[PDB]
RNA sequence: GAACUUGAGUGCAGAAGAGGAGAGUGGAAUUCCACGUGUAGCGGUGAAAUGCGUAGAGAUGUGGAGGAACACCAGUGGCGAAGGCGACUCUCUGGUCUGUAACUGACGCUGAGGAGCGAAAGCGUGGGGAGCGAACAGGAUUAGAUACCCUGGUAGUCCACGCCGUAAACGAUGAGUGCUAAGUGUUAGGGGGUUUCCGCCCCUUAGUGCUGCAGCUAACGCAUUAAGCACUCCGCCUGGGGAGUACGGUCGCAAGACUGAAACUCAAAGGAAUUGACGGGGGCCCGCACAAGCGGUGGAGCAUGUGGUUUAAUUCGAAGCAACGCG
């Protein structure tokens, strides 16, 4: 059964980008929608809908592909799982590669990227990265 | 990319005496791998077969100058940490600090001192085949992202990206 | 070849109507196949527990000779 | 703690199916028994023989006995968790699929240990026994033939109950979920489009095949039935032998099963693909290759060369074709 949606959520991005597709559709949630909030204001996606219906809303995501049809997103990975949560300290928040991809912790502050936790002195769950 | 405008380094790789059996013996044939740079970020690499040795070596050459492509460099160094992947060979190329060379293993060396990149650590974590791992090593260093360019594609200054 | 029972809009193939039966069977009493008669895969079936019921109660033979 | 309905399940309406257990019934064929007709072989092999037959065989007609398996249908067709399930009828009974949105509202996934099931052989008790057939006997074959082949043939194959618990038990591919081009068959449904229909066409689920993008792979290949991209859980691997062995423990009537080492020993073992070579593999083609003919050699006397042996030396070289009236 479904164990991880952002995990998934992640997925049905990578999919869709590796075949270039324009939009995907992903089934929305509070965490998934502020992950897609991010994305859209780091420039990694072109824009983010989202719709709502009887069930759990759904979120359409409008993928961003350069000059020469180039990928701009060209890996996600998961970091946190729910086998093996991944905290970290204010610190410790990483850097993904070497700065020029960011990564999404989720804080008490709120879900920020790497760069504004990092600012806020703040830590916590380490969600993704992104580059 | 036209090699004769850049000044070509030719580095002989390796030379490995191969063997087509026929009726009554052994066709043996030398079969050379050449990397050409201009270390000024240009690098490629040629295989070349021949009855002769230097003949091998003089395919190579050309195979090699066909083949070059251009090697994103941050100053001394490569923009990020990558993990060049082909087959089973498969090359981590991590960027170093200033000073610190070249830190590489034979056939992955002869590539970044070719391509012109002064300061890198790298391990060959797969086969160490070497047309392989120089294959792994230009599929990695074919997947560097230039801050300047990421930047343009994500729609930010790099003031924004490095942050 | 088209199904004869779909085109008749035959619903209910019956072991006793050996007329029709007859028209599956070989010279010999061999139940012909599907892909000779281009009877559809579902009535073959059906047509196929008509024929035995019938060579069971002897209105079809097993065997003629 | 309170809500929601997508997951999961229930209700309601349909569909297919060698799914299972029990009880019956049917037709073909083999064997055996009785009888009629009928006469000299039948059977078997590469060739034979052993074997059966004048005591009437084999062949042929009628009837009967008994056991096992279910031609045609039949189909990379169906069903099942797997093993597996194929004549027909009835009794009991499990699961899956489709539509519906009437109901519950996360009730779900995986699952060590555990329990149940689990082809064939095998085991215990008792039945049954046509065909087949380990063992075994005989006849052949062979240098030998404890085999292949032939004629017989016991256990077994079958049934009831119990035990055993292993297979190349295989898709050599754990289960669950979601995402990611298409084309094309085929099985069971649903909806629709011109209609009495038939049908054609369109769409949709869920299976089952082939081809084939992206992607993956050492390669071969996989590719919406993934071996792709992900997340959850379980099992398992860490060079080849020693070895699935020894010791211990659990299980078993037994055979053995499960669990499972080390000393010692090697520097390989191995996967895929490539070039050739080879095959008592296939195809095609050619040659005094065979076939169609002619004349020889091998026998005899002698010439010559060689081998062996004898010599004081019997000079040296040549050794399948391709050395031997050769230097």
């Given at each position: 059964?479904?164990?991880?949606?952002?995990?998934?959520?992640?997925?049905?991005?990578?999919?869709?980008?590796?075949?270039?597709?324009?939009?995907?559709?992903?089934?929305?949630?509070?965490?998934?929608?502020?992950?897609?909030?991010?994305?859209?204001?780091?420039?990694?996606?072109?824009?983010?809908?989202?719709?709502?219906?009887?069930?759990?809303?759904?979120?359409?995501?409008?993928?961003?592909?350069?000059?020469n049809?180039?990928?701009?997103?060209?890996?996600?990975?998961?970091?946190?799982?729910?086998?093996?949560?991944?905290?970290?300290?204010?610190?410790?928040?990483?850097?993904?590669?070497?700065?020029?991809?960011?990564?999404?912790?989720?804080?008490?502050?709120?879900?920020?990227?790497?760069?504004?936790?990092?600012?806020?002195?703040?830590?916590?769950?380490?969600?993704?990265?992104?580059? | 990319i036209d090699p004769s405008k850049l000044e070509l380094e030719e580095r002989?790789?390796?030379?490995?005496?191969?063997?087509?059996?026929?009726?009554?013996?052994?066709?043996?044939?030398?079969?050379?791998?050449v990397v050409v740079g201009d270390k000024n970020g240009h690098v490629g690499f040629g295989?070349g077969?021949?009855?002769?040795?230097?003949?091998?070596?003089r395919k190579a050459v050309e195979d090699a100058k066909k083949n070059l492509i251009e090697v994103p460099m941050?100053?001394?160094?490569?923009?990020?940490?990558?993990?060049?992947?082909?087959?089973?060979?498969?090359?981590?190329?991590?960027?170093?600090?200033?000073?610190?060379?070249?830190?590489?293993?034979?056939?992955?060396?002869?590539v970044?001192?070719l391509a012109g990149?002064?300061?890198?650590?790298?391990?060959?974590?797969?086969?160490?085949?070497?047309?392989?791992?120089?294959?792994?090593?230009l599929?990695?260093l074919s997947?560097?992202?230039?801050?300047?360019?990421?930047?343009?594609?994500?729609?930010?200054?790099?003031?924004?990206?490095?942050? | 070849?088209?199904?004869?029972?779909?085109?008749?809009?035959?619903?209910?193939?019956?072991?006793?109507?050996?007329?029709?039966?007859?028209?599956?069977?070989?010279?010999?009493?061999?139940?012909?196949?599907?892909?000779?008669?281009?009877?559809?895969?579902?009535?073959?079936?059906?047509?196929?527990?008509?024929?035995?019921?019938?060579?069971?109660?002897?209105?079809?033979?097993?065997?003629?000779?």
């Amino acid at each position: 059964v479904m164990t991880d949606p952002i995990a998934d959520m992640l997925t049905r991005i990578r999919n869709a980008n590796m075949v270039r597709h324009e939009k995907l559709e992903i089934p929305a949630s509070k965490l998934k929608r502020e992950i897609a909030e991010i994305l859209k204001r780091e420039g990694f996606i072109r824009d983010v809908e989202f719709v709502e219906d009887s069930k759990q809303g759904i979120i359409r995501v409008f993928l961003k592909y350069g000059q020469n049809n180039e990928r701009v997103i060209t890996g996600l990975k998961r970091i946190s799982k729910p086998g093996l949560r991944v905290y970290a300290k204010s610190n410790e928040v990483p850097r993904v590669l070497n700065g020029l991809g960011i990564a999404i912790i989720s804080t008490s502050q709120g879900v920020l990227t790497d760069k504004e936790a990092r600012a806020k002195q703040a830590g916590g769950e380490v969600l993704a990265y992104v580059w | 990319i036209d090699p004769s405008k850049l000044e070509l380094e030719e580095r002989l790789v390796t030379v490995n005496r191969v063997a087509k059996v026929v009726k009554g013996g052994r066709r043996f044939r030398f079969a050379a791998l050449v990397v050409v740079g201009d270390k000024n970020g240009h690098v490629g690499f040629g295989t070349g077969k021949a009855q002769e040795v230097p003949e091998a070596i003089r395919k190579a050459v050309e195979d090699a100058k066909k083949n070059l492509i251009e090697v994103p460099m941050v100053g001394t160094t490569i923009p990020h940490e990558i993990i060049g992947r082909f087959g089973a060979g498969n090359i981590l190329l991590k960027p170093a600090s200033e000073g610190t060379g070249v830190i590489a293993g034979g056939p992955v060396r002869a590539v970044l001192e070719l391509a012109g990149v002064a300061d890198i650590l790298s391990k060959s974590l797969g086969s160490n085949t070497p047309i392989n791992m120089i294959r792994a090593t230009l599929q990695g260093l074919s997947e560097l992202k230039r801050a300047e360019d990421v930047a343009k594609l994500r729609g930010k200054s790099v003031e924004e990206l490095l942050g | 070849k088209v199904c004869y029972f779909t085109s008749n809009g035959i619903t209910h193939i019956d072991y006793k109507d050996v007329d029709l039966l007859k028209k599956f069977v070989s010279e010999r009493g061999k139940i012909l196949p599907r892909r000779v008669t281009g009877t559809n895969a579902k009535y073959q079936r059906k047509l196929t527990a008509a024929i035995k019921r019938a060579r069971q109660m002897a209105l079809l033979p097993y065997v003629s000779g």
